[PDB]
Design an enzyme around this catalytic site. Structure first.
Site, PDB file in Angstrom:
ATOM      1  N   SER A 189       1.600  -4.955  -5.651  1.00 44.90           N
ATOM      2  CA  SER A 189       0.760  -4.230  -4.457  1.00 44.90           C
ATOM      3  C   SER A 189       1.239  -2.579  -4.500  1.00 44.90           C
ATOM      4  O   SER A 189       0.493  -1.858  -4.018  1.00 44.90           O
ATOM      5  CB  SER A 189       0.405  -4.869  -3.219  1.00 44.90           C
ATOM      6  OG  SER A 189       0.023  -6.378  -3.333  1.00 44.90           O
ATOM      7  N   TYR A 214      -6.987  -5.934   4.555  1.00 47.61           N
ATOM      8  CA  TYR A 214      -6.281  -5.609   3.333  1.00 47.61           C
ATOM      9  C   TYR A 214      -7.098  -6.375   2.153  1.00 47.61           C
ATOM     10  O   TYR A 214      -7.112  -7.488   2.231  1.00 47.61           O
ATOM     11  CB  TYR A 214      -4.946  -5.879   3.450  1.00 47.61           C
ATOM     12  CG  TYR A 214      -4.100  -5.703   2.373  1.00 47.61           C
ATOM     13  CD1 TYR A 214      -3.789  -6.562   1.175  1.00 47.61           C
ATOM     14  CD2 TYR A 214      -3.496  -4.503   2.231  1.00 47.61           C
ATOM     15  CE1 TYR A 214      -3.005  -6.225   0.244  1.00 47.61           C
ATOM     16  CE2 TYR A 214      -2.591  -4.033   1.369  1.00 47.61           C
ATOM     17  CZ  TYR A 214      -2.291  -5.045   0.166  1.00 47.61           C
ATOM     18  OH  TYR A 214      -1.532  -4.508  -1.006  1.00 47.61           O
ATOM     19  N   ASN A 260      -7.708  -6.219  -2.432  1.00 44.47           N
ATOM     20  CA  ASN A 260      -7.896  -5.891  -3.924  1.00 44.47           C
ATOM     21  C   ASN A 260      -9.244  -5.318  -4.223  1.00 44.47           C
ATOM     22  O   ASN A 260      -9.322  -4.557  -4.955  1.00 44.47           O
ATOM     23  CB  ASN A 260      -7.096  -6.765  -4.580  1.00 44.47           C
ATOM     24  CG  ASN A 260      -5.666  -7.176  -4.150  1.00 44.47           C
ATOM     25  OD1 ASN A 260      -5.065  -6.380  -3.831  1.00 44.47           O
ATOM     26  ND2 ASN A 260      -5.187  -8.532  -4.421  1.00 44.47           N
ATOM     27  N   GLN A 292      -8.792 -11.112  -2.511  1.00 43.99           N
ATOM     28  CA  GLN A 292      -8.556 -11.149  -3.886  1.00 43.99           C
ATOM     29  C   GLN A 292     -10.129 -11.368  -4.232  1.00 43.99           C
ATOM     30  O   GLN A 292     -11.070 -11.948  -3.536  1.00 43.99           O
ATOM     31  CB  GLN A 292      -7.636 -12.443  -4.486  1.00 43.99           C
ATOM     32  CG  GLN A 292      -6.467 -12.700  -3.727  1.00 43.99           C
ATOM     33  CD  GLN A 292      -6.574 -14.146  -3.501  1.00 43.99           C
ATOM     34  OE1 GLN A 292      -7.410 -14.950  -3.400  1.00 43.99           O
ATOM     35  NE2 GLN A 292      -5.200 -14.843  -3.598  1.00 43.99           N
ATOM     36  N   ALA A 345       4.502  -7.485  -1.120  1.00 42.50           N
ATOM     37  CA  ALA A 345       4.519  -8.885  -0.511  1.00 42.50           C
ATOM     38  C   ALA A 345       3.156  -9.492  -0.581  1.00 42.50           C
ATOM     39  O   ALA A 345       3.168 -10.843  -0.645  1.00 42.50           O
ATOM     40  CB  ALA A 345       5.350  -8.698   0.833  1.00 42.50           C
ATOM     41  N   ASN A 348       9.308 -13.028  -4.930  1.00 44.36           N
ATOM     42  CA  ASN A 348       8.660 -12.656  -3.669  1.00 44.36           C
ATOM     43  C   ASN A 348       9.115 -13.146  -2.267  1.00 44.36           C
ATOM     44  O   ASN A 348       8.656 -14.235  -1.866  1.00 44.36           O
ATOM     45  CB  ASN A 348       6.886 -13.128  -3.761  1.00 44.36           C
ATOM     46  CG  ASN A 348       6.348 -12.959  -2.430  1.00 44.36           C
ATOM     47  OD1 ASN A 348       6.512 -11.701  -1.741  1.00 44.36           O
ATOM     48  ND2 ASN A 348       5.507 -13.855  -1.882  1.00 44.36           N
TER      49      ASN A 348
END
Length: 317
Positions: free
Chosen positions: A61, A141, A143, A117, A274, A299
Site C-alpha cells: 500500500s 480506505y 484500493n 479490494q 499494513a 506483515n
C-alpha cells in the site's frame, strides 16, 4: 553513521524483529537530508539470501504515495483537476451516482463506500456499485478507489500508467531500482530513501510540476480526528504521541478542508503497507528534515511499526 542514529536504530529495531519474528528487514533513516542504511535477515528466507541495499521489496500500500504524487504532478501540468467529475474521464460510467463523484473523491477514499479490494468475483462492478453515503462525507480506505483514480489521472498525459510513472516520477527522482508492472510497486531501501528525501524537501526537486505535485500530495483535503488525508500520504500535526498516530475496514466521517491546506511542514507524514498485508512503512517530518523507511516482507501489526518509527524519529529530532 552518527552514534545517535546507530544507537537508536539497534536499540529499537532488533527488539522489534524478535518480538514480531520478522525474517528480513531494511531500514533507512534520513537525518538532516542524508540517508543511513541498515539490514537484517533474509530476502530469500528459505535459501538464505541476505537483505542488502539493493534487495527488492514489494511496497504494497506504500505504492499509493507514488499514485498520489503522479496525480499531483498531473494537476500541476494542467492535465487534471480533482474537482473534475469521474465521468469526464470515464464516460462509460453512466450511473446516477457517478455524476457528483469527483477525482478528489476517488484519490482520497471519500466516494461513498467503494470497497477495500475489488471483489474476487470492472466496468460491470463499477456501474453496479451504489454508494452507501453521499460523496465527500465518509472516508473508507479502498484500493478500488485510488486505483481507479490513478487510471483516470493519466488519461490526459498520452501515456500508460506504467510509462507516466516511470518517466514523470521514477526517472526524475533517479529511482533506478524501482519497478511497476501494470497489465503495485517494488523498490529498494536506497530508492525509498531517495523517495523520502524528495517528499521531505520538494524544493530541491528541479522538475517544476513534480515539485508542485509532491507538495499537492501533502495538501490537507479531509480531517478525521487527529489525521488529515493527502493524496496517498496521510498526516498528523507534529508533535504527536504514537498512541494518537495509530483493525479492518474503518469508514470515518470526514470534515472537508475547503480549500485544501498547503503542505504543513510541522507534520508527521506517513503511509503503512499494513492494510494490504505488506510489511512496509514510511514516515517523515518535513520541518525536521527527518524520516524513516522500514521495508519487510512479513506483515507485522501496524502499531509496532509506528512505535519503532516514532522511537527513532523522536530521538533524533
Amino acid at each position: 553513521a552518527p552514534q545517535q542514529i546507530n544507537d537508536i536504530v539497534h536499540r529499537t529495531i532488533t527488539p522489534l524483529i524478535e518480538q514480531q519474528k520478522i525474517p528480513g528487514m531494511a531500514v533507512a533513516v534520513i537525518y538532516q537530508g542524508k540517508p543511513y542504511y541498515f539490514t537484517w535477515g533474509y530476502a530469500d528466507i528459505a535459501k538464505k539470501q541476505p537483505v542488502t541495499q539493493q534487495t527488492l521489496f514489494e511496497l504494497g500500500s506504500v505504492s499509493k504515495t507514488f499514485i498520489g504524487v503522479l496525480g499531483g504532478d498531473a494537476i500541476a501540468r494542467g492535465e487534471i483537476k480533482l474537482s473534475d467529475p469521474t465521468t469526464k474521464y470515464w464516460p462509460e460510467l453512466t450511473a446516477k451516482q457517478w455524476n457528483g463523484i469527483t477525482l478528489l473523491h476517488l484519490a482520497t477514499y471519500t466516494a461513498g463506500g467503494l470497497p477495500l479490494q475489488v471483489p474476487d468475483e470492472l466496468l460491470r462492478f463499477y456501474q453496479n456499485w451504489q454508494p452507501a453515503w453521499a460523496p465527500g462525507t465518509q472516508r473508507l480506505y479502498a484500493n478500488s478507489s485510488i486505483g481507479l483514480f490513478g487510471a483516470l489521472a493519466v488519461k490526459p498525459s498520452g501515456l500508460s500508467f506504467e510509462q507516466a510513472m516511470q518517466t514523470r516520477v521514477f526517472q526524475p527522482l533517479k529511482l533506478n531500482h524501482t519497478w511497476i508492472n501494470v497489465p503495485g510497486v517494488k523498490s529498494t531501501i536506497e530508492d525509498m530513501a531517495r523517495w523520502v528525501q524528495s517528499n521531505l524537501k520538494p524544493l530541491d526537486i528541479n522538475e517544476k510540476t513534480l515539485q508542485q505535485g509532491i507538495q499537492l500530495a501533502q495538501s490537507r483535503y479531509w480531517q478525521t480526528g487527529d489525521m488529515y488525508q493527502g493524496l496517498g500520504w496521510e498526516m498528523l500535526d507534529w508533535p504527536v504521541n504514537p498512541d494518537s498516530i495509530i483493525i479492518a475496514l474503518a469508514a470515518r466521517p470526514v470534515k472537508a478542508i475547503t480549500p485544501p491546506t498547503p503542505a504543513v511542514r510541522a507534520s508527521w507524514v506517513h503511509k503503512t503497507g499494513a492494510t494490504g498485508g505488506f510489511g512496509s512503512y514510511v514516515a517523515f517530518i518535513p520541518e525536521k528534515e527527518l524520516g524513516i523507511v522500514m521495508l519487510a516482507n512479513k506483515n507485522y501489526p501496524n502499531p509496532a511499526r509506528v512505535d519503532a518509527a516514532w522511537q527513532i524519529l523522536n530521538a533524533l529530532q
